């Protein structure tokens, strides 16, 4: 495949009633989850979620566990800090979210890096594309930005995003290449559902595909149509692949005018489906 990403997602939820925040971390390469940590799980370790990460040795798992536990403690502190910055009661539960990662492009070299942080589901602070400056959403985040500028946090992050992140993404892509570098083109078909004596629904299905990115469009006589159509959100099958469908309502007898066009990284040219079975 021809661009790739590695991304880590972190969520902490405060528990004002009793105890520490709930903390859940997940890591992905592309659309494949490969590690988890859950503060409520018994292991208290970073755990594998893909077979190709299992071959990493104990030093890896120890280091990744140490990092992820330290991160959890940082969010525990942050939840207290943020409640103060926003003059909020101790009584309510609040949420921190962080996502960071890096992309390699078509030339297999660094393409971009990112790091975004949110409080209660809204943007808080984010690293800009240049990996040198921060976007702060409000005056609480502006306090964090000044802090982080003075501590050279961006320089440290940038070194990671351009260096270790890219290097380890490439390592995972090779070690897991049998799946990570396999494209699964959608398995496509159409179904037909009479809605009345005069109209019918055509439903264009895309199944068992990877990666998740896909485009389904309908055309009538070779022109895109969005009126009288419905598209569902791309959804996981549960086996690592994805599903989607798009539907159009048409005058009974005129089905053959309509075409469903399917674009996906696994397809050298887009597919075109037509009800003429």
């Amino acid at each position: 495949m021809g661009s790739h990403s590695m991304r880590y997602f972190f969520t902490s939820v405060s528990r004002p009633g009793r105890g520490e925040p709930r903390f859940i971390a997940v890591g992905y390469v592309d659309d494949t989850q490969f590690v988890r940590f859950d503060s409520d799980a018994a292991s208290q370790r970073m755990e594998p979620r893909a077979p190709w990460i299992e071959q990493e040795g104990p030093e890896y798992w120890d280091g990744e566990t140490r990092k992820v536990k330290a991160h959890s403690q940082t969010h525990r502190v942050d939840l207290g800090t943020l409640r103060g910055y926003y003059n909020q009661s101790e009584a309510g539960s609040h949420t921190v979210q962080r996502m960071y990662g890096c992309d390699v492009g078509s030339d297999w070299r660094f393409l971009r890096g990112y790091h975004q942080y949110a409080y209660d589901g809204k943007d808080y602070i984010a690293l800009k594309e240049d990996l040198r400056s921060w976007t702060a959403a409000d005056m609480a985040a502006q306090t964090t930005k000044h802090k982080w500028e003075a501590a050279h946090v961006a320089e440290q992050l940038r070194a990671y995003l351009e260096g270790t992140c890219v290097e380890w993404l490439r390592r995972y892509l090779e070690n897991g290449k049998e799946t990570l570098q396999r494209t699964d083109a959608p398995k496509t078909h159409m179904t037909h559902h009479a809605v009345s004596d005069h109209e019918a629904t055509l439903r264009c299905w895309a199944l068992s595909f990877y990666p998740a990115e896909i485009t389904l469009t309908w055309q009538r006589d070779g022109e895109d149509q969005t009126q009288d159509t419905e598209l569902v959100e791309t959804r996981p099958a549960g086996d690592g692949t994805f599903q989607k469908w798009a539907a159009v309502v048409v005058p009974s007898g005129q089905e053959q005018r309509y075409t469903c066009h399917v674009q996906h990284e696994g397809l050298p040219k887009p597919l075109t489906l037509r009800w003429e079975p």
Binding site: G63, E64, R66, H71, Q73, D78, A141, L157
Partner: peptide, 10 residues
């Protein structure tokens, strides 16, 4: 591989 050793606090 995660960013380490530990993110800066807000």
């Amino acid at each position: 591989r995660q960013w380490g050793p530990d993110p800066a606090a807000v």
